[PDB]
Amino acid sequence: SGATSQAASQSASSSYSSAFAQAASSALATSSAISRAFASVSSASAASSLAYNIGLSAARSLGIASDTALAGALAQAVGGVGAGASASAYANAIARAAGQFLATQGVLNAGNASALAGSFARALSASAESQSFAQSQAYQQASAFQQAAAQSAAQSASRA
C-alpha cells in the first residue's frame, strides 16, 4: 500500500488551543452530570471557586500540578461569564482556559491536543461529578465530622 507521510512532527502547530477545547466537548457530552455539578451552584463567584477547586483536582488527574496559574485564569474564564450565558459558556471558558495553559506547548504537541483535551474534560468533569458527593456532604458531616468535633482548633469545622 505505501502510506506513511510523517508530514513533520506536529500536524499544523498554530491554532491547537481552540481545537483542544473542541475535543474536550467530545468527552464532556459523554458526561451530562457535569451540567448537574453547575446546577448545584447558583452563584457566579462560587462557580469561580468551583473552577479553582476542581481545576486543582483535575491538575493531578492530568499530571500538570501547575494549576496555580491555570485556576487563577479558569476562575476568570468561568467567572468572566458567571451567570448570564449557560453551562455552555462555563464549559467553553473552562475548556478554552484549560487549553490556554496546556497550549503553552508543555504537553500540547498539535497531534495529541484532542486526545489530552478529551481526557482533561472527562477528568475535570469526573472530578466535578464526584465532587457533587463532597459539595453536598452536609449530611455526611452531620455524622462523621460531629463525632470528630474533639479537635477544637479555631471554631469546629472549616475556617477563613
Query: In what helix (H) or strand (E) does residue 22 lie, and over which residues does it extend?
Result: helix 16-28
Determine contact, residues 81/89, Cβ cutoff 8 Å: yes
Match 491547537 to its residue by C-alpha cell.
16
Considering its fold, how many domains does the chain have in total?
A: 1
Contact 98, 122 (CB under 8 A): no
What method did the depositors use to determine the structure? NMR
Report CA-CA distances (Å) from 116 to 25, 62, 98, 152: 12, 8, 11, 44
List the domain range (segments joined by +) for residue 48.
Answer: 1-160
Grid cell, residue 15, equals 491554532
78 CB neighbour count, 10 Å cutoff: 26
Instruction: Pinpoint the alpha helices (H) of 40-160.
Output: 44-62, 67-79, 87-102, 113-135, 138-144
* Complete DSSP assignment for 24-52: HHHHHTT-THHHHHHHT---HHHHHHHHH
- C-alpha to C-alpha distance for 90 and 10, rounded to whole angstroms: 30
Most distant CA pair in the chain: distance in Å?
A: 73
| 3-state per-residue secondary structure call for 82-104 | CCCCCHHHHHHHHHHHHHHHHCC
C-alpha cell at 73: 485564569
* Angstrom distance (rounded) from CA 86 to CA 92: 10
Distance CA 92, CA 140 (A): 33
Residue 52 maps to which CATH number? Answer: 1.10.274.60
C-alpha cell at 93: 471558558
Q: How far is CA 151 from CA 146, 154, 156, 157, 160, in A?
A: 11, 9, 7, 9, 17
Gap between the Cα atoms of 58 and 61, Å rounded? 5
Estimate the share of the chain in helix, then strand, then coil, as percent rounded to the nearest 5.
Answer: 60, 0, 40
